Symmetry: C3
Subunit: 261 residues, 3 copies
């Protein structure tokens, strides 16, 4: 049961509003290996998660201006595999909503299931498969809070098309030799890596990349009306048979200018 | 852990037996949009769930005679997405068993995965896929109570063939232009609606319709020996690619006469 | 949340080390119908689970020498369907590690999904599919204990190849008419048996046999560095459409001699 009341989000949000003059419209959640993205922020202000009332423990929240856009960034995220229920993993997203954030950018490291993928590739997330969600492990599980969103939110249009279009055209302006990949991200609980049988299984379900986060954050963001778009850094080609983080940082930085104000 | 002792079911059952002279042999569980089915009951008696000891909160239980058959009807059901564990969602089924009920009729609103389905269609449930059940979210999870059923109940014959046969022949007597659909119902936790990738995934698993209930009720009913049959009201054709409630009420009403006594 | 501290495993392990002179290098986990495997032990010593501090309740642990190899055997195992979280189901594996065990042999009764399987067949487990694991129901869920293993353990090489090779050559020396089967074991929560739609679904995921255990034990064993190999006794051919325990005991006994010392 969600151990957070509506007021808890509000308290946390007002705490942040009074401790920084920063008023972000964009929020970015970074997983593992994308910490250099926070060093590009100007007029930056960092808050350790441990100093923010109600924030899940263990990692920091960095406010600042990235390529002209005011944003708030999660340096380190939460995972189901660490033991947190999704209502803790996604706590920050609802706080962002209360801060006035309108767009959420999600990033993650993932295993490439699509044969055509190569290490270091950047896959624009066009869709996702939420396996934990099939069994009820859903961040929206429990009473619905109308002040956030509706009881039965649609997820088919989760990854904003306009931003995905900007992403492609922006990538083209970067003059990259490798095309910007695009595909379906499947989330699994973890923490162990998949077996061959499971890897094949996932590929046949239509997934292009596999990871252990993001989906719950996206679901909660869509529920509370945030515009969403994200990317997966293919850190390794998953083996289907028996026997670049810097570029992503630059890319997300450039996209700020393409996000509608 | 099932927060109900065997005695809790018994207490609830005797409470109901002493508050109504009605002695139902058939139980009907209605989801959303099938409330007019309760208005067809004669010599009806309603109990709000809140006045019945032990009943899960938030909705009423209506006793009465439907087309000559004495039955008990759930107007409003419980869902995993609301936060209830399956032992609460399925609490009523075991109570029905203790009331002397022999047949359970389940109904639900569902999304059509089968391309040949049309809005308003009525799909006789021939089989189901219990996704939450694959991860252990099972209403039978925990110590087995032999006074109800066996430890490892078979589910392959869950939807009574004889009733499915009656359903088809009865539908034919109704002179309906649209054929009575038949297929596999897949249950997901919810509450968000599926993405395109998930919708395709489900269709490839062999599911004809998708919903957020019923399966746990059917499993518990089969476990305690109840005869089962049900229907899905296809309220919308699910989109598989990127870019009638009154009739059901009449149908279930007519089928009472086909249920063996 | 894992209700066991590192010290709990240690306490249990030292308790056993001081109550028997036996110092096993191999551990065997037996499910249902493989109890005669314990009667082949010499210089045997039995401990009821109920007399071992910290051991999950309801079944015994038998130490002894099997075909020249000192081993510890679980006669009766734990299942998710009984209500235990995986940290209780897999408690013994970590204890074995602390006892100095290096190899874990897992056995189970399973339903045959592969059409070519026959009742009584013995399927060497080459790989597995962990459905509960896709939703987070993972024995490794929670903080990682480095004294056991790494945060993100690989599972693709879970079933030791060398032992699988020994298994085949050993089976050939047995002069059995039926070949030693080999395949992928898929674990589901249970306790109900699958429907036709689910059975087909599982087969299409690439599973050869279906059961309700083993996978969590294997995962924890691999996490703490144990060599693993196992077998599934096909007790029945699963019906895919709508309408030997003694040999296994002998086989596992013979394989002791093939396990590296
Ligand atoms: N399931 C799975 N996950 C893989 C794989 N490779 C990398 N990750 C990513 C590891 C987790 C990444 C993260 F969760 F930490 P994140 O926060 O960066 O998303 C893989 O093969 N399978
Ligand atoms: N998963 C899923 N469910 C869908 C869909 N359309 C209607 N429902 C039914 C909504 C829930 C119905 C109910 F649970 F409330 P019930 O009680 O009527 O079954 C769909 O596309 N996907
Ligand atoms: N899911 C599933 N399991 C089946 C089937 N047949 C036997 N078991 C094995 C029954 C459980 C075995 C056990 F868990 F008790 P174990 O300890 O022997 O592994 C089947 O068709 N489906
Ligand atoms: Mg704190
Ligand atoms: Mg009450
Ligand atoms: Mg004890
Ligand atoms: Zn202050
Ligand atoms: Zn009274
Ligand atoms: Zn003693």
């Amino acid at each position: 049961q969600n151990g957070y009341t509506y007021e808890d989000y509000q308290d946390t949000a007002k705490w942040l509003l009074s401790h920084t003059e920063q008023r972000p419209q964009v929020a970015v959640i970074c997983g593992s290996g994308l910490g250099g993205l926070v060093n590009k922020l100007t007029q930056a202000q960092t808050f350790d998660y441990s100093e923010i009332p109600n924030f899940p423990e263990s990692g920091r929240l960095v406010f600042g201006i990235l390529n002209g856009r005011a944003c708030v960034m999660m340096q380190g995220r939460f995972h189901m595999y660490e033991g947190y229920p999704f209502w803790k993993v996604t706590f920050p997203v609802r706080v962002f909503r209360l801060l006035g954030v309108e767009t959420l950018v999600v990033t993650n490291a993932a295993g490439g299931l699509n044969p055509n993928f190569e290490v270091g590739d950047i896959m624009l997330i066009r869709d996702h498969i939420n396996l934990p969600g099939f069994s009820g492990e859903n961040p929206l599980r429990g009473p619905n809070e109308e002040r956030f969103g509706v009881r039965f939110p649609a997820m088919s249009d989760a990854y904003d098309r306009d931003m995905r279009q900007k992403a492609h055209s922006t990538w083209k302006q970067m003059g990259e030799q490798r095309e910007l990949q695009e595909g379906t991200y499947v989330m699994l609980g973890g923490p162990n890596f998949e077996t061959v049988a499971e890897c094949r299984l996932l590929r046949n379900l239509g997934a292009d990349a596999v990871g252990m986060s993001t989906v719950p954050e996206v679901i909660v963001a869509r529920h509370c009306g945030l515009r969403v778009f994200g990317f997966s850094l293919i850190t390794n080609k998953v083996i289907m048979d028996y026997e670049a983080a810097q570029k992503l940082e630059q890319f997300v930085s450039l996209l700020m200018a393409s996000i509608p104000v």
